[PDB]
Structure 1
Amino acid sequence: DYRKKYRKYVRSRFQCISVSLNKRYTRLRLIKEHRSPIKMELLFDPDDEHSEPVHTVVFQGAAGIGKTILARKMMLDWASGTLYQDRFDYLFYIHCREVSLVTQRSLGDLIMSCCPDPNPPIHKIVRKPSRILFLMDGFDELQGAFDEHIGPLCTDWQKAERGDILLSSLIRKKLLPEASLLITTRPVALEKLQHLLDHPRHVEILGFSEAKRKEYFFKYFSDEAQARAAFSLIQENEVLFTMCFIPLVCWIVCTGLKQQMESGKSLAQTSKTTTAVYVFFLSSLLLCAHLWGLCSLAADGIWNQKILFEESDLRNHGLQKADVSAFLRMNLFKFYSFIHMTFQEFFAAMYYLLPSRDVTVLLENYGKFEKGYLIFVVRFLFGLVNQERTSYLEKKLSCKISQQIRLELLKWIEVKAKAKKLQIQPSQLELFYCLYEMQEEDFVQRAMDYFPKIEINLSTRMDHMVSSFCIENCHRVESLSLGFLHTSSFCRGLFSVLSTSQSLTELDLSDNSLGDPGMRVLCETLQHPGCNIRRLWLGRCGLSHECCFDISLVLSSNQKLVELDLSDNALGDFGIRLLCVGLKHLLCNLKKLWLVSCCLTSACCQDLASVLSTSHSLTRLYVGENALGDSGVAILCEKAKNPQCNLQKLGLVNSGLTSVCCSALSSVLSTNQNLTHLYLRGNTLGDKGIKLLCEGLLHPDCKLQVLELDNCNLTSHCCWDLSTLLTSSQSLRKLSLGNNDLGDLGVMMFCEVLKQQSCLLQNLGLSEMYFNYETKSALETLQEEKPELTVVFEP
Structure 2
Amino acid sequence: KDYRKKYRKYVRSRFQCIESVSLNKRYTRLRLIKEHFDPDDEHSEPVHTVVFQGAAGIGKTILARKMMLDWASGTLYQDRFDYLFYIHCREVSLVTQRSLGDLIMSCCPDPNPPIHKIVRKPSRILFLMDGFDELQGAFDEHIGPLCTDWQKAERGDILLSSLIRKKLLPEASLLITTRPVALEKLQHLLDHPRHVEILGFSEAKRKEYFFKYFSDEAQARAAFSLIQENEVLFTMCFIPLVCWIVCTGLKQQMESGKSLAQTSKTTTAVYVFFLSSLLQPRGGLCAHLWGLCSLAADGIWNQKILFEESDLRNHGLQKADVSAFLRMNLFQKEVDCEKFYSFIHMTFQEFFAAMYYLLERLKLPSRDVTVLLENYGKFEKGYLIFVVRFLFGLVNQERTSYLEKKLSCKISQQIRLELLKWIEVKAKAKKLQIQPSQLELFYCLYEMQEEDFVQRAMDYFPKIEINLSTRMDHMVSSFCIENCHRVESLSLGFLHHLTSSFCRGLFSVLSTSQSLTELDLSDNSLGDPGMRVLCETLQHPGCNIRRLWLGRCGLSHECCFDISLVLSSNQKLVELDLSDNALGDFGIRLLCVGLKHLLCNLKKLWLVSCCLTSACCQDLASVLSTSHSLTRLYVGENALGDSGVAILCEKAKNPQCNLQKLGLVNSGLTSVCCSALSSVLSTNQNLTHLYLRGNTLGDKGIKLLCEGLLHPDCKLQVLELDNCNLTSHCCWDLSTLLTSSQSLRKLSLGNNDLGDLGVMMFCEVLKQQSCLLQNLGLSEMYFNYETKSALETLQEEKPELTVVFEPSW
TM range (shorter): over 0.9
Q: Give, in whole Å, the separation in 2 of the partners of 1:568 and 1:718.
A: 35
Contact 1:451–1:476 (Cα < 8 Å) also in 2: yes
The change in CA–CA distance for 1:6 and 1:98 in structure 2 (over 3 A counts) is same
How much has 1:436 moved relative to structure 2?
0.9
Q: Deviations over 1:100-119 (max 9, x none)?
A: 33134334544544555442
Q: Deviations over 1:269-302 (max 9, x none)?
A: 4321110111111111113321221221111111
Q: Give, in whole Å, the separation in 2 of the partners of 1:368 and 1:358.
A: 15
Q: Give the match's secondary structure for 1:2.
A: helix
Q: Which moved more, 1:431-440 or 1:739-748?
A: 739-748
How much has 1:506 moved relative to structure 2?
0.3
Q: Give, in whole Å, the separation in 1 of the partners of 2:616 and 2:470.
A: 40
Q: Which moved more, 1:629-638 or 1:180-189?
A: 180-189
How much has 1:123 moved relative to structure 2?
2.5
The change in CA–CA distance for 1:546 and 1:290 in structure 2 (over 3 A counts) is same
Q: Deviations over 1:548-581 (max 9, x none)?
A: 0000000000100110010111111000000000
Q: 2:240 aligns to what?
A: 247
Q: Deviations over 1:296-339 (max 9, x none)?
A: 11111110100011111121112232331565699999211101
Q: Give, in whole Å, the separation in 1 of the partners of 2:121 and 2:391.
A: 50
The change in CA–CA distance for 1:159 and 1:74 in structure 2 (over 3 A counts) is same
TM-score between both structures, scaled by the size of structure 2:
0.93
Q: Deviations over 1:117-153 (max 9, x none)?
A: 4424222222221232111211113467555445414
How much has 1:600 moved relative to structure 2?
0.5
Q: Give the match's secondary structure for 2:465.
A: strand
Q: Give, in whole Å, the separation in 1 of the partners of 2:43 and 2:762.
A: 53
The change in CA–CA distance for 1:448 and 1:49 in structure 2 (over 3 A counts) is closer
The change in CA–CA distance for 1:325 and 1:498 in structure 2 (over 3 A counts) is farther
Q: Deviations over 1:226-273 (max 9, x none)?
A: 221111110110100000000011111111001000234455643211
How much has 1:372 moved relative to structure 2?
8.5
Q: Deviations over 1:146-196 (max 9, x none)?
A: 554454141222231422222122112333231111111122212321232
How much has 1:603 moved relative to structure 2?
0.5
Question: Which residue, 714, 726, 734 being the options, matches 1:702?
Answer: 714
The change in CA–CA distance for 1:467 and 1:699 in structure 2 (over 3 A counts) is same
Contact 1:140–1:369 (Cα < 8 Å) also in 2: no
The change in CA–CA distance for 1:172 and 1:488 in structure 2 (over 3 A counts) is farther
Q: 1:585 aligns to what?
A: 597
Q: Give, in whole Å, the separation in 2 of the partners of 1:128 and 1:491.
A: 53
Q: Deviations over 1:42-82 (max 9, x none)?
A: xx999999999512111111110011111111101011111
The change in CA–CA distance for 1:294 and 1:775 in structure 2 (over 3 A counts) is same
How much has 1:386 moved relative to structure 2?
1.0
How much has 1:717 moved relative to structure 2?
2.1
Identity %: 100
Q: Which moved more, 1:193-202 or 1:144-153?
A: 144-153
The change in CA–CA distance for 1:370 and 1:658 in structure 2 (over 3 A counts) is farther
Q: Give the match's secondary structure for 2:316.
A: coil
Q: Which moved more, 1:626-635 or 1:774-783?
A: 774-783
The change in CA–CA distance for 1:705 and 1:124 in structure 2 (over 3 A counts) is farther
**2:344 is equivalent to residue 344 of structure 1:** no
Contact 2:211–2:217 (Cα < 8 Å) also in 1: yes
Contact 2:366–2:415 (Cα < 8 Å) also in 1: no
Contact 2:624–2:659 (Cα < 8 Å) also in 1: yes
Contact 1:170–1:176 (Cα < 8 Å) also in 2: yes
How much has 1:424 moved relative to structure 2?
2.6
Q: Give, in whole Å, the separation in 2 of the partners of 1:85 and 1:768.
A: 61
The change in CA–CA distance for 1:120 and 1:697 in structure 2 (over 3 A counts) is farther
Summarize the alignment of residues 435-454 of structure 1 with structure 2, pairs less than 5 Å apart: 435-454=445-464
Q: Give the match's secondary structure for 1:552.
A: helix
Contact 1:640–1:668 (Cα < 8 Å) also in 2: yes
How much has 1:693 moved relative to structure 2?
1.4
Q: Which moved more, 1:253-262 or 1:482-491?
A: 482-491
Contact 1:55–1:181 (Cα < 8 Å) also in 2: yes
The change in CA–CA distance for 1:702 and 1:370 in structure 2 (over 3 A counts) is farther
Q: Which moved more, 1:433-442 or 1:25-34?
A: 25-34
How much has 1:419 moved relative to structure 2?
1.5
Contact 1:330–1:336 (Cα < 8 Å) also in 2: no
Contact 1:573–1:604 (Cα < 8 Å) also in 2: yes
How much has 1:418 moved relative to structure 2?
1.5
Q: Which moved more, 1:737-746 or 1:495-504?
A: 737-746
The change in CA–CA distance for 1:247 and 1:389 in structure 2 (over 3 A counts) is same
Q: Give, in whole Å, the separation in 1 of the partners of 2:184 and 2:158.
A: 18
How much has 1:434 moved relative to structure 2?
0.5
Q: Which moved more, 1:771-780 or 1:539-548?
A: 771-780
Q: 1:260 aligns to what?
A: 253
Q: Give, in whole Å, the separation in 2 of the partners of 1:108 and 1:298.
A: 29
How much has 1:356 moved relative to structure 2?
8.3
Contact 2:763–2:791 (Cα < 8 Å) also in 1: yes
Contact 1:384–1:390 (Cα < 8 Å) also in 2: no
The change in CA–CA distance for 1:724 and 1:108 in structure 2 (over 3 A counts) is farther
Q: Which moved more, 1:745-754 or 1:569-578?
A: 745-754
TM-score between both structures, scaled by the size of structure 1:
0.94
Q: Give, in whole Å, the separation in 1 of the partners of 2:55 and 2:459.
A: 29
Contact 1:386–1:438 (Cα < 8 Å) also in 2: yes
Q: Give the match's secondary structure for 1:519.
A: helix
Contact 2:669–2:695 (Cα < 8 Å) also in 1: yes
Contact 1:553–1:582 (Cα < 8 Å) also in 2: yes
Contact 2:571–2:600 (Cα < 8 Å) also in 1: yes
Q: Give, in whole Å, the separation in 1 of the partners of 2:621 and 2:194.
A: 51
Question: Which residue, 169, 172, 178 being the options, matches 1:176?
Answer: 169
The change in CA–CA distance for 1:697 and 1:198 in structure 2 (over 3 A counts) is farther
Q: Which moved more, 1:676-685 or 1:418-427?
A: 418-427
Q: Deviations over 1:721-778 (max 9, x none)?
A: 2111211120111122112212322222222322232233321222222222222222
How much has 1:215 moved relative to structure 2?
0.9
Q: 1:12 aligns to what?
A: 13
Q: Give the match's secondary structure for 1:184.
A: strand
How much has 1:447 moved relative to structure 2?
0.5
Q: Which moved more, 1:371-380 or 1:331-340?
A: 331-340
Q: Give, in whole Å, the separation in 1 of the partners of 2:88 and 2:557.
A: 53
The change in CA–CA distance for 1:31 and 1:332 in structure 2 (over 3 A counts) is closer
The change in CA–CA distance for 1:47 and 1:73 in structure 2 (over 3 A counts) is closer
Q: Give, in whole Å, the separation in 1 of the partners of 2:287 and 2:42.
A: 61
The change in CA–CA distance for 1:786 and 1:172 in structure 2 (over 3 A counts) is farther
Please list every run of 5 or more consecutive structure 2 residues that lacks an aligned counterpart in the other structure: 280-284, 332-338, 360-364
The change in CA–CA distance for 1:297 and 1:730 in structure 2 (over 3 A counts) is same
The change in CA–CA distance for 1:192 and 1:791 in structure 2 (over 3 A counts) is farther
Q: Which moved more, 1:677-686 or 1:462-471?
A: 677-686
Q: Which moved more, 1:356-365 or 1:175-184?
A: 356-365
The change in CA–CA distance for 1:142 and 1:326 in structure 2 (over 3 A counts) is farther
Q: Cα RMSD (Å) of the superposition?
A: 2.7
How much has 1:99 moved relative to structure 2?
2.1
Q: Give the match's secondary structure for 2:522.
A: coil
Q: Deviations over 1:348-389 (max 9, x none)?
A: 101110088621111112445578932321100110111554
Q: Give, in whole Å, the separation in 2 of the partners of 1:158 and 1:168.
A: 16
Q: Give the match's secondary structure for 2:52.
A: strand
Q: Give the match's secondary structure for 2:198.
A: strand
Contact 1:288–1:397 (Cα < 8 Å) also in 2: no
Q: Which moved more, 1:690-699 or 1:409-418?
A: 690-699
How much has 1:642 moved relative to structure 2?
0.7
Please list every run of 5 or more consecutive structure 1 residues that lacks an aligned counterpart in the other structure: 35-43
Q: Which moved more, 1:601-610 or 1:221-230?
A: 221-230
The change in CA–CA distance for 1:769 and 1:66 in structure 2 (over 3 A counts) is same
Q: Give the match's secondary structure for 2:132.
A: coil
Contact 2:300–2:382 (Cα < 8 Å) also in 1: no
Q: Give the match's secondary structure for 2:492.
A: strand
**2:207 is equivalent to residue 207 of structure 1:** no
Aligned residues: 786
How much has 1:86 moved relative to structure 2?
3.0
Contact 2:163–2:169 (Cα < 8 Å) also in 1: yes
